[PDB]
Every structure is written in structure tokens, then in C-alpha cells.
Amino acid sequence: WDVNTHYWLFKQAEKILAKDVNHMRANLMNELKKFDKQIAQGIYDADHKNPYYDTSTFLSHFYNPDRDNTYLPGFANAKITGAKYFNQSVTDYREGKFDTAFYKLGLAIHYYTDISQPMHANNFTAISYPPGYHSAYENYVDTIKHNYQATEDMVAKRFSSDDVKDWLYENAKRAKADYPKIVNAKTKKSYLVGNSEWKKDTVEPTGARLRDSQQTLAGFLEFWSKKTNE
Amino acid sequence: WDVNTHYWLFKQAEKILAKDVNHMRANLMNELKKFDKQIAQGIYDADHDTSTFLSHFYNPDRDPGFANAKITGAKYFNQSVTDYREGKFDTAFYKLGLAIHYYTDISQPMHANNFTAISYPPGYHSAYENYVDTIKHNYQATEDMVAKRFSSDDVKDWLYENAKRAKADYPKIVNAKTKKSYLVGNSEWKKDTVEPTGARLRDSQQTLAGFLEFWSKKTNE
Ligand SMILES: [Fe+3]
Ligand SMILES: [Fe+3]
Ligand SMILES: [Fe+3]
Ligand SMILES: [Fe+3]
Ligand SMILES: [Zn+2]
């Protein structure tokens, strides 16, 4: 996903938690508010710094759940990297290192939301054909995400596992399922010809993907809270 | 708002002032620390006839020989400033505590709209304030907060503006849904009011920090 889609997803997920408050969510919400700056910096650092250091860090933003099986040394994908920061943040929190914990939570949020973008779940990079469509699409999403803010009917979506690796896998699987709505013969030809049909063709599937990502991120934050409270 | 929401608001406002402290604010922070007990007792004493009861309410949209919270809050604030300037610091900070009590009271929407313990449904007022007491700790001061100021040299206008902000939130606290919830005896009103309560508490902390900074400027001018 000055693009701010990742932080925006975090804010929408916070709204989903707040609108249906319960005991544990109230404690989590107070923490997320108090440590917003630390979380925001983690999101930003993964967003605007990490992808551009080399190809190892660039690859860390992608995870194809139907391919990226074995870990080749020095080539961590988004599932491995996201799980690393998530698990370290839980450990730091439980040791009382809150500032670091919430920063690393921000890092984990970036990787988890990155693979909710279908291109990131199917090895479609900025140099995949047609070159430039990846960045054009993400810039476009930034301009229209405000039409798909959290709504009253939404819920936190959870996955059935105590292991965050599986949350990352399942979030990417859902995104990959939407890849044909974003990258297809029609949108690729539209982007090459230079008309805006790809924008009209992808806006509603983008809105559904963003609204799903908000909900799975709300569940992910609740899961983070559960792990810290174990 | 042993319910301690009023003192809690003062402690949150103190945190807001402390995090953005500079040399011009530094003396006030030490004063608040040195006179915490006097301020706390001023807040506590205001909490406990008809003159004293009416004095905790101020509907800013309405016009008795009896003082409302704007008049009583301004009385103690202005006296506190005078006492400070005459060197009567123990008394100055005690009356500051009284003034803090009246100012934070009308940051509570019911107090800004004549909704008392006997207003219908009777008992909802105290049920709400007791509930707020139990959940305020989820809305403590955060680093994004600031002291909020109003454009006036007259504390009466600060009291008016604080009450107007509270009154705008009254429909979020007292409405057909919450009143029916409280009457039927389920807890739905708690779920419906928690987020507006959190927003009200966060605004009140910030306007109180501005109020303390404003008081300090008056004492040092
Ligand atoms: Fe991204
Ligand atoms: Fe991308
Ligand atoms: Fe009160
Ligand atoms: Fe009251
Ligand atoms: Zn009172």
C-alpha cells in the first residue's frame, strides 16, 4: 500500500475496536493512544526507509503464500520479518520495555498490512509487467482510501491460531484471492494505453480489500494484546 | 464528575503542562507540586443547602439570587489571584482548588444542562458519574495533547466556553436510548456512553491545563 495508507489502516482498525468496546479492548485502546507516536514511527520507518536499502529489504515486503515456502538465508520475506517484529514486541512488552515494544508493533503492523495488498501477495513488483503499475496503483489507492473508512457493520476478524506466522499467511491468502481484480488483461491494457479505466475497474475491489484489511488488522491488534496478556 | 474524577482531571492537566514545560511555565509546575495538598483539599471541599447545590450547575444558554457554577467558579478564581498577589499562598492555592472544581464540573454535560440527581430518570446522573470514575483511567493524558486556551481576559468567558463544549455533548450522554437502557436495567448505556465520555474527559483535561496556565499568567502579570 507522502502516501499514508498504512497508518490510515491502523487508524481505521482503532475505530473498529473503539466502536464495540469491551474490557480487554479498553485497555488495549488506552495503550495504542498513549504510544501512538512510537507505533506511527515504526509504521513510517518500515514504510519509507526499509524498502529502499537493498533487494533483501525490498523482498521483505512481499510474501506469496503459495510459493515462499523455505527461507533462503539472507532473503527474509514479509511473513518471516513480520513475525520477527511481532514476537519481539510481545517479549519486550512483557519485560516492560514499552517504548521499544510499541515501536516494533508499528513495524509488525507495516508488514502485516503490506501483504494485505494483492500485488504483495503475488510477487508483483514495480518492475513486473507493466512496469510502473504497482506504484501507480498504490498512489491511486492513497487518493481514494478516504471513501472506505471503517463502518458500523465491521468487526475485528480473527484467524484460528496462536502463532502470528499463520495470521500473516491467512492475511496474504485473502489478498492473493483478490489479485485477479487488480491485475488482469483489462487493467494492464488500460494502464498501458494511458486511460483511467483501470482506476474505475479497481476502485470498488480496492475498497473491499481495504475494508477487509482494516478488519483483519483490528483482529491482529487484539491478538497482539492477547499475546502480551498470556 | 470516593469518586475522584475531579482531582484526576487536575493530575492529567498537570501532566499536559509538565510535558511541554519551558522556563516560563517552570515556576507554576513547582507551585502545583508544593501546594498539591491545598489544591486537592480545595477540590475535595467544593464537592461536599440549595445555594451550594445550584452552584454546581451552569446552563450557558440560560439567564434566582443564587449563584451558578460560572459565578461561583469565577468568584474563587478571581479571589485566588488576589490572594496570590498579596502573598497568601496557602489560601491562594486552596481557592484555586475550589475554582478547579467548579470549572471541571461544567465540563460534565449534565452539569451544563440542568440535569441533576432528581432529573428524570432519577439516579441516572449519579450512575453515570460513578461509571465515569471506574473507566477514566483508560483516558489518561497522552503526548499529543496540548493546553487549550480561550480568547478572553475574563475567567467568566472561560467558564462559559467550557460549559458550551460540554453541553454540545449532552445528547451523547442523555437521550432516548440511554434513558431507556438505564430504566430497563441493562448496561447498554455504559457501552453507548464510553467513547463520548472518553472524548469529553480528554477535552476537559486540555481545557483545564489552559485554565491553569491562564491562572498563572494572571498571578504573575
Ligand atoms: Fe505498502
Ligand atoms: Fe507496494
Ligand atoms: Fe462533579
Ligand atoms: Fe454531578
Ligand atoms: Zn460540584
Numbering used by the authors:
A (entry chain B): 1, 10 to 238
B (entry chain A): 1, 10 to 56, 62 to 76, 81 to 238
From the paper:
Its two major virulence factors, broad-range phospholipase C (LmPC-PLC) and the pore-forming toxin listeriolysin O (LLO), enable the bacterium to spread in the host by destroying cell membranes. Two phospholipases C (PLCs), phosphatidyl inositol specific (LmPI-PLC or PlcA) and broad-range (LmPC-PLC or PlcB), facilitate vacuolar escape of Lm by cooperating with LLO in vacuolar membrane disruption. LmPC-PLC exhibits broad substrate specificity, with the highest activities towards glycerophospholipids with phosphocholine, phosphoserine, and phosphoethanolamine head groups, but less towards phosphoglycerol or phosphoinositol head groups, and also hydrolyses sphingomyelin (SM).
Of all the constructs, LmPC-PLCC143S+C168S had the highest solubility and successfully produced crystals. Therefore, to determine the crystal structure of LmPC-PLCC143S+C168S (referred to as the crystal structure of LmPC-PLC in the rest of the text), we used X-rays with a wavelength of 1.26 Å near the absorption edge of Zn, based on previous studies suggesting that three Zn ions are in the active site of LmPC-PLC26 and the Bc and Cp homologs. Interestingly, while the strength of the anomalous signal at the metal ion position 3 was comparable between the anomalous difference maps of 1.26 Å and 1.33 Å data, the anomalous signal at metal ion position 2 was significantly weaker in the anomalous difference map of the data collected at 1.33 Å, suggesting that the metal ion position 2 may contain Fe ions in some molecules and Zn ions in others. The absence of a pronounced electron density in the anomalous difference map in molB at metal position 1 and the shorter distance between H69 and H118 than in molA indicated that no Zn or other metal ion was present at this position in molB. A glycerol molecule was bound in the active site of both molecules, originating from either the bacterial growth medium or the cell lysis buffer. Interestingly, the N-terminal residue W1 is well defined by electron density in both LmPC-PLC structures, while there was no traceable density for the following residues S2 to T9 connecting W1 to the αA-helix.
